[PDB]
Nucleic acid binder design. Structure first.
Lengths: 83, 96, 108, 89, 96, 82, 108, 90
DNA sequence: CTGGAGAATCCCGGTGCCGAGGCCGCTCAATTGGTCGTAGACAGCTCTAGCACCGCTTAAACGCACGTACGCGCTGTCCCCCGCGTTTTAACCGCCAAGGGGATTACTCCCTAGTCTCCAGGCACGTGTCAGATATATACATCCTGT
DNA sequence: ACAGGATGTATATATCTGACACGTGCCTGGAGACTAGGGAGTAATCCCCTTGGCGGTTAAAACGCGGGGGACAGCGCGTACGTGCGTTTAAGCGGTGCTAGAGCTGTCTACGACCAATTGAGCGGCCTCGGCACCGGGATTCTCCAG
């Protein structure tokens, strides 16, 4: 467990089914799971990437929660509950 | 005689249950290592706040929830109850 | 030696700090000058909206016989008000959840 | 923070009800965010009309721009009443 | 023998022809009077700039163009080619 | 005289031509009235906000800039009038 | 008597006016202070983007055998450049029309 | 005051034998002013989030990296960086 | 379709722990009390252009006749994802230990705002011409009737 | 589907004008140069919490074996909107005259920023107990089998 791995399954399939239930989804296609990994992956890359842009500007080696919050704000998805 | 529920029963029960509750559903360490793994492209051996990963889970699950609600609006709007990838794609287009 | 100080909020019969909010306005890079009635007026509006949300959250807390407010009630309160939901349609509240909302065709 | 002030308002609305720290932080984020929105819209209102001062007029108009219906109306009622009260004192 | 053409052909010619051009497609005076009429609820006998009304026509027609494109994405998405009010309602819901 | 029922002045053929410019190929008959209502409410919102600027602006005539700023207010910035 | 002046744009090999952009920055309520490399950097970026869109626009005007640029070519330039289109996805250009975009199923 | 003739100078760099219209020039001025305000606003948030009270070319550079997608941002950093460097030796 | 059986979850009852809530030093920020400079309200006036009004045409709206091309439901096909138990991992939980680095403070540099003068690119405002408005005729393009 | 005919539309070609392009008088805003203040870097530190290790359990991921329940196409019904055309209008074009009011200019007052000194509410840390967690057991509730 040193460098990149098969952690794309880390958001697991039953976890996707649970989150979909919390989202109100009643039936889930088999293609939806792969679609969720890809679309969610891309989205997170965008937002977290922007957070990293803040952090690399911030002259830090540790990503703080504020970078994630401001990153969410950057896309008009402002976050309440972390400062 | 198995004690097995019909399709949709457990689904709807967990809908009402997990929508009634508010606790996080993704495992700490794998998701955090996935975050660091995707984050590898900027700095090797990154140190991340635990609460930052908590916020990442919050934004991720909430974002997926809202996005799939819109997907559901499309599927029901398109006379379905089983969501398809192109509904997510349409949602991304309208959102941008 | 000098005359006693009272909060400008209390002079307006308010709880929110006119001074601190006013300072955030001054240091907030918005304009060269901020009118004297502005922080009083703003503090009154925010305290009013705050009273609305807290009042609804209090009610929601009573609906489960609990005296300690948790984020879930704030979620219910925000999404159950049309004008606040219109004010807060793109915002995410940590640990809040979602209002129970299942489309009619999905319910049996 | 503004924590204890939200607690003060809470004691005005529900004297026997308490509140968690995490929810209090959320409310602090709400106050700061909406505050920044209102001040920003007031800032562009000053710019558009070539004004360099944000007065009660700009705030009132901005509130009318940002808040829908009765929240705005009663916000003008409570705000205006309050400004009158301070104008007395 | 009439030279009455076929349903959809002239529509396509309007699509290509009017999407090839850019001029406004609504009469100035009725639109202007509509602006003043709805505007009545603030001041009676309102005076308006002509070019402002023209800008209102610009914004209005462009907004309709984009909204109906999204509507069309929903209709084709929902396997239709005839737009329905529900599509517009879905568009307004997702747009906020 | 005072103006009345000018919502019908935005004619159905004009709406057809716009929808063709919008890329619509077939239009339901209910769409025309739905469009008058939806577009009407929309314009009430944007123009109403412009009037809020104007009444703040101490003017009796709505300038184009008010319309531009109103469009910006809803995140629909307009190029070509100031 | 004083020294030979020279525009900051030319010293940076730029066309766009450093001074007015810097003035808008100062009187635009953004910060207490704005760094010296900021206006030069900004004018270079905007000039570069301007060159990109005017280049695409000029080519588009050439495509219709005309020498005067009209808004239509600006609309074409914006919606045809993916990154600029992303930058301007929710902006409305008056008298611009749209790109010819008919959904494949709608064509015969 | 407008950027009209400056856009014309850029036009003379890209297409010397091509003309323009006042309305399209107004559109371009609106584009420059709008994108300008976006960049300055984001730079303001950048200074604020880390409680910096100074917007420098570093904040502008990061801001440009935030706003412009991909290769346009890379060439923006290229042209701006080269430009600023070229100026700082004069 | 109507009626009986069972478990999950809620609920009903009873128990102990710790974080929320209330206290307690200890700041440091909001308040008051002045003063200074100025943004902006006000009054009258200018004079554009918006209102108001005149007059004739047909672009455009409205309505009708006709046909066509569009949505939608049902049944079947099939097909695939949900449900649950079982195994297995390894996250989780509970536990052990160092020091990286976040955050701080202390020094000191040096970068950026502010001014005054000067002047030159640009501002407003006129002028001529070729872009563009207009005219006329046609193969090509597009449709469509016809075979 | 294949072929020929008819007409719109851009195109070939040909003509006429005005708004764009360029010039001028003038200005006011940007550059030079200079100062003064103060934001942020650098160095080195403390100690939190991150990293990195041990160790057992079962939550949870993965998988398999049904099988229930959902997407989708055909197809036939069956409608209603588009296209064009003829009539009619008032917008359009263009033409007329005045003054409402945007905008300016000159007033002068009023308001918000600013600084310093004090201080009391609030900040940070520190307990305390009943909210909450935990547990155990039945009603309700919801599902599902049964006749």
């Amino acid at each position: 467990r040193k460098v990149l791995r098969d952690n794309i399954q880390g958001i697991t399939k039953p976890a996707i089914r649970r989150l979909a239930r919390r989202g109100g989804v009643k039936r889930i296609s088999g293609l939806i799971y792969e679609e969720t990994r890809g679309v969610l992956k891309v989205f997170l890359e965008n937002v977290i990437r922007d957070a990293v842009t803040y952090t690399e500007h911030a002259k830090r080696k540790t990503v703080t929660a504020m970078d994630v919050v401001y990153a969410l704000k950057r896309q008009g998805r402002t976050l309440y509950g972390f400062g | 005689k198995p004690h097995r529920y019909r399709p949709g029963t457990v689904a709807l029960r967990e809908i009402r249950r997990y929508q009634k509750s508010t606790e996080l559903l993704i495992r700490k360490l794998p998701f955090q290592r996935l975050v660091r793994e995707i984050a590898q492209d900027f700095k090797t051996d990154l140190r991340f706040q635990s609460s930052a990963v908590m916020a990442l889970q919050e934004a991720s699950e909430a974002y997926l929830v809202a996005l799939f609600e819109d997907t559901n609006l499309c599927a029901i709007h398109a006379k379905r109850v089983t969501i398809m990838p192109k509904d997510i794609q349409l949602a991304r287009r309208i959102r941008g | 030696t000098r005359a006693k100080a009272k909060t400008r909020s209390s002079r307006a019969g308010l709880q929110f700090p006119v001074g601190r909010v006013h300072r955030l306005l001054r240091k907030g890079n918005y304009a060269e000058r901020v009118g004297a009635g502005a922080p009083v007026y703003l503090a009154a509006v925010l305290e009013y909206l705050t009273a609305e949300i807290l009042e609804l959250a209090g009610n929601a807390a009573r609906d489960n016989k609990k005296t300690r407010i948790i984020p879930r009630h704030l979620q219910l309160a925000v999404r159950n008000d049309e004008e606040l939901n219109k004010l807060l349609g793109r915002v995410t509240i940590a640990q809040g959840g979602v209002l129970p909302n299942i489309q009619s065709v999905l319910l049996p | 923070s503004y924590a204890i002030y939200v607690y003060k308002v809470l004691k005005q609305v529900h004297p026997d009800t308490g509140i968690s720290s995490k929810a209090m932080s959320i409310m602090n984020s709400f106050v700061n965010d909406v505050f920044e929105r209102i001040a920003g819209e007031a800032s562009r209102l000053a710019h558009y009309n070539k004004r360099s001062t944000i007065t009660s007029r700009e705030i009132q108009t901005a509130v009318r721009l940002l808040l829908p219906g009765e929240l705005a109306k009663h916000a003008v009622s409570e705000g205006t009443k309050a400004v009158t009260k301070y104008t007395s004192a």
